[PDB]
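in:
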């Protein structure tokens, strides 16, 4: 079976600037809602555009990230559509 073991060497929540999707633009907010494989954070980018993310950007397991929980993400603006998305979603405790 697959063991989802971790290594105490490199994690994103440690402030990984060396690798990142958005230009040092890791934002932190709370999950507003989650729909199937997609989540939304309480971060309105434009006119009330709720920040969306896919469960693939989620921390490890798709069932490990819950709505109403604090998360860390990276807000990358779609230069094509104008909206943004959360990439590299980490579980945050508060």
């Amino acid at each position: 079976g697959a063991k989802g073991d971790l290594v105490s060497f490199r994690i994103d929540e440690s402030g990984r600037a060396a690798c990142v999707n958005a230009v040092r633009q890791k934002k932190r907010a709370t999950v507003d809602s989650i729909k199937g494989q997609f989540g939304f954070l309480n971060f309105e980018v434009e006119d009330g555009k709720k920040l969306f993310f896919h469960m693939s950007e989620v921390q490890g397991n798709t069932v490990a990230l819950h709505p109403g929980d604090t998360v860390e993400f990276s807000v990358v603006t779609n230069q094509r559509n104008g909206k943004s998305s959360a990439c590299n979603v980490l579980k945050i405790n508060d």
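note: Residues 10 and 16 are 8 Å apart (CA to CA).
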